[PDB]
Enzyme design. Sequence first.
Site, PDB file in Angstrom:
ATOM      1  N   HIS A 287      49.259  40.234  45.696  1.00 54.13           N
ATOM      2  CA  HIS A 287      49.659  41.213  44.705  1.00 54.13           C
ATOM      3  C   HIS A 287      48.428  42.036  44.399  1.00 54.13           C
ATOM      4  O   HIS A 287      47.341  41.764  44.859  1.00 54.13           O
ATOM      5  CB  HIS A 287      50.252  40.555  43.437  1.00 54.13           C
ATOM      6  CG  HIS A 287      51.680  40.153  43.579  1.00 54.13           C
ATOM      7  ND1 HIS A 287      52.697  41.075  43.724  1.00 54.13           N
ATOM      8  CD2 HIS A 287      52.231  38.939  43.847  1.00 54.13           C
ATOM      9  CE1 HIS A 287      53.848  40.418  43.917  1.00 54.13           C
ATOM     10  NE2 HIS A 287      53.594  39.130  44.017  1.00 54.13           N
TER      11      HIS A 287
ATOM     12  N   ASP B 162      48.224  48.756  43.439  1.00 56.52           N
ATOM     13  CA  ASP B 162      49.591  49.202  43.723  1.00 56.52           C
ATOM     14  C   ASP B 162      49.771  50.719  43.758  1.00 56.52           C
ATOM     15  O   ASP B 162      50.484  51.268  44.612  1.00 56.52           O
ATOM     16  CB  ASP B 162      50.584  48.512  42.784  1.00 56.52           C
ATOM     17  CG  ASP B 162      50.956  47.072  43.122  1.00 56.52           C
ATOM     18  OD1 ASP B 162      50.518  46.595  44.177  1.00 56.52           O
ATOM     19  OD2 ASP B 162      51.597  46.400  42.249  1.00 56.52           O
TER      20      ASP B 162
END
Lengths: 354, 354
Positions: free
Chosen positions: A121, A151
Amino acid sequence: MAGPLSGLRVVELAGIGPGPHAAMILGDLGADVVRIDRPISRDAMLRNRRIVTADLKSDQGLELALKLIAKADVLIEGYRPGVTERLGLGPEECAKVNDRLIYARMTGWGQTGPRSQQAGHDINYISLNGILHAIGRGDERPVPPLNLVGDFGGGSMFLLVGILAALWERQSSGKGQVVDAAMVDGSSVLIQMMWAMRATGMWTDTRGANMLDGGAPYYDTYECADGRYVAVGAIEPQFYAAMLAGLGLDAAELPPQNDRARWPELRALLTEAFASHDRDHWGAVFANSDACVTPVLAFGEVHNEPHIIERNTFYEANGGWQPMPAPRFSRTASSQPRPPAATIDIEAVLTDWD
Amino acid sequence: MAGPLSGLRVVELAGIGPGPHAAMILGDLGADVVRIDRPISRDAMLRNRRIVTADLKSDQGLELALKLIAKADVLIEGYRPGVTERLGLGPEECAKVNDRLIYARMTGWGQTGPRSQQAGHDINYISLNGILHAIGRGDERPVPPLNLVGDFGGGSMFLLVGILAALWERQSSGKGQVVDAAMVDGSSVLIQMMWAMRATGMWTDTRGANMLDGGAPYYDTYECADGRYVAVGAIEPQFYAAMLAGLGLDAAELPPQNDRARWPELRALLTEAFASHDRDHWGAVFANSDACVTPVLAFGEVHNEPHIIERNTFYEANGGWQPMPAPRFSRTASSQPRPPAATIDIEAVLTDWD
């Protein structure tokens, strides 16, 4: 559909985080985005889409997807490397039906290398490239800057740049290609200023002791009398001067701005001054000045801020505010985003697309 | 020049922060970038440029600048709104000599509105739209995530998207237009996922108490025996399970992953586990699994990490490392960046550009 990307056709294979963010911005700017999900969303991120379903593991679903892709300018996928390959939706298969296709692959670790098949992540991608280490106060363990750097800033935004760059290329080559957007790469280019500054002594690897990380008393937040905060960004001497002027502090009584040895002292004097009045007092004091002092607004106050109101940075949707499209275009402007709508028939989309 | 933007011509009016970062990425991807400065740089950010000088306040420099702009696809400027106007280089003046120009305006506050003439820096833009408030531990004042979110993620990166999208629009209109890229806008779109989640109960305005801000024991850093850190990002239950196994913890003896009331307990057990060995011990335990545990590397260790080595994320320059171009293109690949070289005569560039 309004915006500069009016006319562009995008297929998005449903995934999480960076891929749908990139698809959203394309739709925001006027692209015609069709998201394929598995067999009405309340996720505002899925604005400016048509949603269709297909089982990509079935013969029928593969075939419908390949027909959509055949008519598209851009494909966005965010699975592990090898996943689209094994589905029959890999780059080589897409190229057989559409060699103008911009095939955009959104991953953390990239298409190859030792970590390429491993889960992760945002926090993981920014931990490996020095970014996470550099965030937070020096007397505590690093804090994640949400998932803004991996991200989005170094993830979906690099996918977008690669997509739009490859479309430019295609204007002269007539052909598409594959974009490998790895968050570990994008985030590193995002922070290139720090890599530059390390080489000239303008940045150190010591946490929370640099000009932009909270180490500098003139580049940080301060707590006010009401327990709320202001941000001070008064780097340039004339901005710093304006900030002292509004505080009513005599420069001759303070340490010099950039005498680092006395930065504790400087910070303690600034802390005491800002703590003497409420946040909103400093908004009045510093009105129309170059002091680089702003209120630190919580999300729930943002829509009441005059500069935010006057520029329509947000719009009201389904029990909450959402950001309007960015950036802004003078001639082909974007419209307010279309909310998520019901699923539709994939056959109907092909017919629209021919 | 190698890359998908080979053939693109860019004039950059010299500035700081977001503007030069956008120019850099255009260069990295093959654009022909010419930066006009005032009358050899050691700033790796100024890679992939040619530098020229001109006094834009004088009749001769303005005329030389306008001849360059006449030949360019893209102009980047980052002064206060009104500045190029009064110099004779505003959009309406540039359109007179080149109606195909993409005029790209990089500001914090935008072209209009009550704050639009006020100084500021990254920290100020993200203070006004709820982003800065959301960063850091709940028991301390907000910490700046360097200048990654305002200047770059929500700044240069949106200017790039605006430039490249406008280039697409230009292909059918035959005209350019003005791109208004405000950091206060871009950063808000960068954080759209949080604005989405607020409307569905998946994000709170309470600092340090969310899934992605360090509020969750499975999405945060931990201090190890040597005072160094790991990052845990094990959101999905299967990734969490792999993490407990690496730590040698029996799940039955822990609270449930998402029993928030017992997150203090869970974090304490996780703290004790990670504290029992040094960072590199955990880096090795977790090198291959889906546990989403990574060592937190400082900048000066990055280049020794295997995944970073194998993919050539960085290259050597000056006395240190710089990030290679991103994202990557399978057919028209970027080359290693060209270092900043000496200034050149503006008239020579005009010759080369015809």
